[PDB]
């Protein structure tokens, strides 16, 4: 078998998961109407192998297979974050901390802008359809959740938009549903870069004609960085190239000047209008709900051209209850940028993480107690400093509760987090509300209350650092097996376990 | 005959053996740390309970240790089966069914204990008078690093009786060996051990309260010992109702208290509230040993002991979830919490204290039809709820009451945490109670200034959407079992193996 590069090539990503027994090719006919979604949910929820649906009801030979759960969790024996690790070309057993720290290290690497390759060598140019041959309604697009507002073709593809001055090309994920034979609609909302760039087209009189590309089965490093809140003005492609150690190979679109990854499974091209809008949503989302007939108009994308590979594969995320990509990518790439912001701001933080169990609503900051102690501060002042750094930023947008814990908590393990949360904060008294900051409109407690009108508040910083940890050493015993007892005793017990009779 | 694990501690051990849920460790184990460490490993992976048959320093009779008598075990055998066996219930009975059974038992005729012959009573097999009491000779475990001492009393039953003899209380409260004749332990309000002790102090007998301390009692008894049943009600009579028969008892050597005839060990003597000794710290239900944070507690003077051949000390070693301080303490508060909701007219279907929340969170499953009939608001309902629970003994340990609608399975922490984070606005949906009694054991209380006031720091958290207070609100829960029509869910489960899943 060839040497696999799953960060660079979507199909190598598929092969590496086969070789790890982490992918199940389903060859029997599966209905894109709910059945795909339901299988994906069953697989996410027990951390099982990713399904590749090779035989979809209503598919042509090329359009398409579906890959579900591309960044779901899997058994610990294989490395439970192996799928995320493979998007970055890392050892499958890498921890999430290491994943995060690698993304931060790649920020100081030389950015490698994309490299144009010949069209004759680019798999995404194998088939080219011009406008009259665009028939979105004939694609076997999944209907992912009951009461979704339409069929969501765009759950794990990359939108490419570029500023008018050509200086900033943004790659990002935002949901899109098929509206009719030629149109997609989806979220283009503040403070997302896709809206920022669309607005820069509006600012010069071209709100009804913004060029885009939508690419599926891009280099897995590209799709991951597509979900990451990197800074404005920074073209994702260049940071992808630093992650990969090589420039992303690209080709020009058929109908505009945008560059698309040469190994994409499927490329859609066209223009976006902010002034022609269509009812969109609802969509089963990151917090675990479909709220019925709660759609709202969004912009229309007119598809004008398409290109694709033989036997093309559509990667799909089907969000809901933890754990899926809206938790493993959205949350952790937020936590990555929250750590960066801590470094920028000088907060005494070791790590950051968004527990999956908290539906990417909670941001846990692991506080370096010595560094905290060096500030000579109080919980009230420190919680204010922290909330003020995070809750007015794009990075802090999805976050409604920042939880501060000492450096004895493994924040990446929710058994330790929930322990620290309930045992170390006094309800209400240890929580600081932030009334005036922008609410995340998707939080169900926000959207299903009068706060959906006012758009402000409902966020807090929760102090789970004991008062004495603001001042000095505080040595207590954590009462479990591994931490509670001397290393000699833990080993002795572990060595003799079978001999005792445990079977 | 038939084993009766509810009535006999040794039948309880036998049915755990019969289910491969008990490991008899026959090599030498040190009660210094090693027992407690083995126990922690067992609890934390829901493994078979250890029976330590050969403790360093033990005599032939005093003693073996059974750890984890109410720990959780594999779902295959019934994960709550140890608790079900304390009540003589099917081992696969769920904790909801356990709770509802305890509530049913409240309607049965109470059966007070019946005296049986001393000659037949196992707990009278060996009898020691005062001079032969040597508590330092017992292989008492040192359960956690930095414990204040060796806690003999973690899963036994204190017996105190009011001076007028109308109420005999059975309860568990920790106790450590002080010296060769004395134990010290918690005796705090609002617990009944303290309430009864105070009634003795009011008539000039604070320094001479009769007590008995019993180990390896009838498991139904040790379970009700951890339950906050009403004041004035003798546990023995409800334990009777649970068993379908009177607990068999015998009189103490040195006082008038009645002890279970099948007890493994009985210690007797006098409690003094006014002779105190440094007690603790102890690794307790919230998961911490706070080093050198002991406090003065009453002294128990042991004047007599009796015991069986080959006696067994049952032991609980608390800490991170899950152990008896969560499965018994929490669930038994929940049981009385549900009973209180019924008596107070709240529309509560079920109550539970998730193990993950270290018995600090009480979840109340609200009947939405009942809530809607109230025509109330969240603010009013949260007040009503906190007022009912936080001002009474049953609410003592609980710092946060979480209200959820009837679509949440409160026995499943995946649904509870999902509902918690998604359905309440941080701070705005929380109502603080400032003037209620704090649980002194909560680490956020003990390690703050609130340790000096003992007031406040409790809250009710509203996880019921605003619309659910008024009318129907049909939304889709985005998971496999709830999100999809039943026919599809069944179809996927039937075809799973054929897809290629293994
Ligand atoms: C991984 C992932 C990220 C989604 C996402 C999903 C996934 C799988 C979906 C498709 C399943 C459902 C909803 N999503 C949207 C989304 N951002 C957004 O504006 N609208 C969305 O609809 N995000 C987040 C978005 O990709 C991140 O906020 C990026 O930081 C945005 O890029 P930018 O920083 O360049 O604006
Ligand atoms: C099961 C159980 C219950 C403990 C307990 C433990 C266990 C295993 C320990 C021994 C491992 C550690 C600490 N415990 C104490 C405790 N109550 C108390 O006042 N002091 C305690 O030290 N409890 C709770 C007590 O048993 C319940 O609150 C009962 O409601 C008390 O009975 P009462 O209502 O008759 O007063
Ligand atoms: K991005
Ligand atoms: K009791
Ligand atoms: Mn961007
Ligand atoms: Mn009582």
Numbering used by the authors:
A (entry chain A): 1 to 503
B (entry chain B): 2 to 503
Quote the passages of the study that discuss this structure, keeping the authors' original sentences.
Prenylated FMN consists of an FMN molecule modified by the addition of a fourth non-aromatic ring joined via N5–C1′ and C6–C3′ linkages between the flavin and prenyl moieties. Following binding of prFMNreduced and formation of holo-UbiD, the cofactor undergoes oxidation to form the catalytically relevant oxidized prFMN species.
E285D exhibits minimal disruption to the active-site architecture, with hydrogen-bonding distances remaining very similar to those of wildtype and prFMN lacking modification on the C1′. For E285D kcatapp has been measured as 0.28 ± 0.01 s−1, and Kmapp has been measured as 20.4 ± 3.6 μm. Movement of residue 282 during the catalytic cycle of Fdc1 could therefore facilitate the shuttling of protons between solvent and the active site. Both the E282Q (A. niger) and E285Q (S. cerevisiae) variants are inactive, whereas E282D and E285D variants retain a considerable level of decarboxylase activity. This suggests the pKa of key groups involved in catalysis is unperturbed by the Glu → Asp substitution, with the lower kcat values observed for E282D and/or E285D possibly resulting from increased proton transfer distances, as the carboxylate group is slightly shifted in crystal structures of these variants.
